[PDB]
Write a protein that binds this ligand. Structure first.
Ligand SMILES: *[C@@H]1O[C@H](CO)[C@@H](O)[C@H](O)[C@H]1NC(C)=O
Ligand SMILES: *[C@@H]1O[C@H](CO)[C@@H](O)[C@H](O)[C@H]1NC(C)=O
Ligand SMILES: *[C@@H]1O[C@H](CO)[C@@H](O)[C@H](O)[C@H]1NC(C)=O
Ligand SMILES: *[C@@H]1O[C@H](CO)[C@@H](O)[C@H](O)[C@H]1NC(C)=O
Lengths: 144, 48
């Protein structure tokens, strides 16, 4: 048996109940205020899990020493602003103290309204530097 | 009666902020409906 309830300084956010029926389905809660002061409580007998997650975006925090990556690109057919074809080049290096590195994954997000060049990806594949390529949901993943 | 210790980092993009709370009726209940997607990290290898 469990009854769980969330409070803020202005009111009670949620009052959920967990029993034999409510055992395999997950309960979802979203806080309307992202900078509030909330408190949960669970009452009854049994064992339960609580998860609290925060989701946000950060603008590419490249300010500290880390697994070094330098990405840039060039144009070949630049016309009246937007260029039809783009050529992306990246440089990768390892700067940790470990003995040797394991397999690595590089992800590139497409520059808004573009799409991958399948012949270029397969040329990268048949050349022996990337062992696997993949393109989905405007992200290109290369597995080194 | 535990509060929630949430602190958004400085130099954060405005408008991108969400606070979620997940509850489960069993200890091993969460990895049930997300079995195809335990992790957002992509696949592509034998161990993956
Ligand atoms: C227990 O859960 C049931 C589910 O429908 C509902 O009656 C209510 O949320 C709870 N009842 C209580 C706490 O008396
Ligand atoms: C939020 O509630 C907590 C409860 O301890 C306390 O810090 C204070 O009442 C509130 N803090 C704010 C409004 O910054
Ligand atoms: C790490 O282990 C490797 C063996 O694979 C060897 O070079 C040495 O014992 C360790 N240190 C460095 C710097 O590699
Ligand atoms: C948790 O509380 C600590 C205080 O001990 C605070 O420094 C930190 O910003 C809070 N939030 C997170 C996500 O650690």
């Amino acid at each position: 048996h469990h009854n769980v309830f969330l409070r803020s300084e202005y009111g009670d956010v949620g009052q959920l109940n967990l029993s034999e029926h409510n055992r395999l389905v997950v309960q979802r809660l979203q806080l309307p205020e992202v900078s509030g002061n909330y408190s949960i409580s669970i009452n009854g007998t049994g064992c339960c899990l609580v998860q609290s997650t925060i989701r946000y975006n950060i603008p590419v925090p490249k300010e500290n020493s880390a697994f070094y990556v330098a990405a840039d690109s060039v144009s070949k057919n630049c016309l009246n602003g937007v260029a039809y074809t783009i050529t992306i080049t990246v440089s990768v290096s390892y700067r940790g103290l470990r003995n040797e590195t394991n397999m690595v994954i590089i992800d590139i997000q497409m520059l808004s309204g573009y799409q991958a060049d399948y012949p270029s990806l397969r040329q990268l594949e048949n050349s022996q530097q990337v062992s696997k390529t993949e393109e989905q949901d405007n992200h290109v993943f290369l597995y080194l | 009666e535990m509060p929630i210790n949430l602190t958004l980092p400085e130099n954060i993009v405005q408008g991108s902020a969400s606070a979620f709370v997940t509850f489960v009726g069993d200890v091993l209940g969460l990895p049930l409906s997300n079995l195809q997607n335990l992790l957002q990290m992509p696949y592509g290898c034998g161990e993956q």
